[PDB]
Design a protein around this ligand. Structure first.
Ligand SMILES: CCC(=O)c1c[nH]c(C(=O)OC)c1
Length: 116
């Protein structure tokens, strides 16, 4: 509270570390469904069903332009990518599978990078 400061983790490397994780995401072989925004004019349903579209290139742009206040807002957008994917795709589809795989890949890198 006021004048009662909690000790707080060093956050000076967060931007660089998030960029690094995002690069590992981008270069994963199952990243292809998520590299670019879904084409809202070629994909039926998507615009109406998915209220907040998100993809790696949009995350990269936001990261590169200081639009994440902290690492948690970054993780929220990354998870949003995979939550959208689950909403729109069958688990037993290539894209569905890819989403699960990439989510797992992210969360381990997240834990290993920041959870001490
Ligand atoms: C034609 C199908 C298609 O373009 C598509 C289906 N699901 C998705 C998607 O969820 O991208 C992440 C794209």
């Amino acid at each position: 509270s006021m004048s009662v400061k909690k000790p707080k983790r060093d956050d000076s490397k967060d931007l660089a570390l998030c960029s690094m994780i995002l690069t590992e995401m981008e270069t994963h072989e199952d990243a292809w469904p998520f590299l670019l925004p879904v084409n809202l004019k070629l994909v039926p349903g998507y615009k109406k069903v998915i209220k907040k579209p998100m993809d790696f290139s949009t995350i990269r742009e936001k990261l590169s332009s200081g639009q994440y206040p902290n690492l948690e807002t970054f993780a929220l957008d990354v998870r949003l990518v995979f939550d959208n994917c689950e909403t729109f795709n069958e688990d037993d589809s290539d894209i569905g599978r890819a989403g699960h795989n990439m989510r797992k890949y992210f969360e381990k890198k997240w834990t290993d990078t920041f959870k001490v």
